[PDB]
Design a protein around this ligand. Sequence first.
Ligand SMILES: O=c1ccn([C@@H]2O[C@H](COP(=O)(O)OP(=O)(O)O)[C@@H](O)[C@H]2O)c(=O)[nH]1
Ligand SMILES: O=c1ccn([C@@H]2O[C@H](COP(=O)(O)OP(=O)(O)O)[C@@H](O)[C@H]2O)c(=O)[nH]1
Ligand SMILES: [Mn+2]
Ligand SMILES: [Mn+2]
Lengths: 297, 297
Amino acid sequence: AIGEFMVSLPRMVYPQPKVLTPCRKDVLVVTPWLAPIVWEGTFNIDILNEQFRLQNTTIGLTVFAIKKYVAFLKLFLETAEKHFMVGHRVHYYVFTDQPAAVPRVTLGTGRQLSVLEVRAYKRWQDVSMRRMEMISDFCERRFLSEVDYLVCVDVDMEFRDHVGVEILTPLFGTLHPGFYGSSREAFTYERRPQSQAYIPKDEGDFYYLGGFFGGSVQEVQRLTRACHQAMMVDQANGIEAVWHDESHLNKYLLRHKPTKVLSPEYLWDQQLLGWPAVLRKLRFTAVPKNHQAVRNP
Amino acid sequence: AIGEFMVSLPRMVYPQPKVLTPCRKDVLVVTPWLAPIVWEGTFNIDILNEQFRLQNTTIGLTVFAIKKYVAFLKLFLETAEKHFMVGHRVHYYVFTDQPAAVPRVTLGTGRQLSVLEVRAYKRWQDVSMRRMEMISDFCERRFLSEVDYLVCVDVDMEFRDHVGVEILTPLFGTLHPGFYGSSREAFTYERRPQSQAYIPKDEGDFYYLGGFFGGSVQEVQRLTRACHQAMMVDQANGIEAVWHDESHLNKYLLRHKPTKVLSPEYLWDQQLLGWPAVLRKLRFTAVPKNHQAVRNP
Ligand SMILES: O=c1ccn([C@@H]2O[C@H](COP(=O)(O)OP(=O)(O)O)[C@@H](O)[C@H]2O)c(=O)[nH]1
Ligand SMILES: O=c1ccn([C@@H]2O[C@H](COP(=O)(O)OP(=O)(O)O)[C@@H](O)[C@H]2O)c(=O)[nH]1
Ligand SMILES: [Mn+2]
Ligand SMILES: [Mn+2]
């Protein structure tokens, strides 16, 4: 449940937060609209686990495995079992054009998996973009009755470390690992005024990822419906945003500020970007792929 | 309104938040349960004003002026007009045993004041404590229909600088200016196990003030009802907590973590504590008083 009566926390023994000692002095840990930016060291997971278990929180995790990307599911799901919301109720929703190719992964107690068959688009861009329509369609029925929060991620990934209830909030995005140190004029937002995703060079807070966002079911429904509608407008006008669904997600999160922002710990590419000092953990990471080969027949 | 459909923010030009630059390196700006700690420099008030004006937010401010404390109202209200939620809808609720002693203060547009007559208790401790009952009684009727948030403060105070929508959240407390640098064993929590306010020496996050707390009407109703009920249990058992309503508020906020914490900028005593470097602003400050004289006939 979200927003129900909250029972008292039990007695807990943990280190006192000290007002005159920051958790992290090397990074921004709160946005200018007072949303936490989630980095290792900023949260006590024991307190958060208590809060969320006392609400019997259920988390849905959506992942698309269309065409050749079914090959990524086994590692994705097996590592999710090790690191994603362990001890909490989890419902995986695997969207695929090949139900028979979904691997048989052994799940911990209180965790379930549903396979949702969908159509495969020819263009990888359309496969990526149509996730917004598909997620919004499934919010309207299944998700509202079955989960409290939705977490929507790419499949070409593996969990390596804890991804837990610290991320949960009405609406979150994740800082793209390529651009967290960049100035806004360098962000690869859509820059053509003819697109609904357009952001001028003097606007923007952060560059968020298309591959890891989420929130309450209500807020995820809103985001995905808005991005789908914006994409349909662009299609009618003969324009496709430079980075597809990610461009639209960035426009949405500029105008509807997220209530938490995840640091790049939560989506990293170690082959491309290494392991900087500012990252104490690499939690969820890119699996190397040959883009041209895996995206086409 | 709270939790209604949120329209898009307009285009705004403001400084980009930089991920590799903290707003404040000298203080903790987020709690271990991912609640912001509100200090100058951590928020862009223009973004926040937009968010809250787009929801047509109404803020109630409760203040008790019982017996001789009616003398503090003129300065309290006149300075509130200069600094408290300016541009937002405000409803002041002045609880008093002397309606005719409430000064005629000129209010800005969109602001109103209601005088609520209540009984005066003999003991200043009981006057302070019974605010919980009185606030919870008035939540049940007036406040739920009239305001979105409640802010509950002491009267023996003046505003000197901005106190605005940065504070608004489901539930907040304020760091006591005497103890923000103290270790938890030094906090003046109730230490007798016989009291409902009891907190052991190895528990506690912060020492919060009885004089400045608030939140949504629902959460303030919960807090005030719980503290009143706990006080009634103590009374039946022949014990009065060491710091009265403040002791109970501290117990409640230990077990029900606030969703924002206000820094001591928001309740300061300059005569007792000066103006430390860590305080960039003194927003709401103690008016000097002779405690013995003003609390008794
Ligand atoms: O043929 C495809 C292309 C894309 N995707 C899905 O769309 C996501 C985004 O595409 P991709 O991971 O290639 O984008 P990148 O991370 O490289 O930006 C993938 O993770 C898959 O979940 C898919 O299932 N099959
Ligand atoms: O005779 C009294 C005693 C207390 N109060 C109210 O109770 C609050 C708390 O008391 P006080 O300010 O004396 O406490 P302190 O700040 O000194 O702890 C005051 O601000 C008033 O709002 C009052 O109205 N009349
Ligand atoms: Mn990917
Ligand atoms: Mn006072």
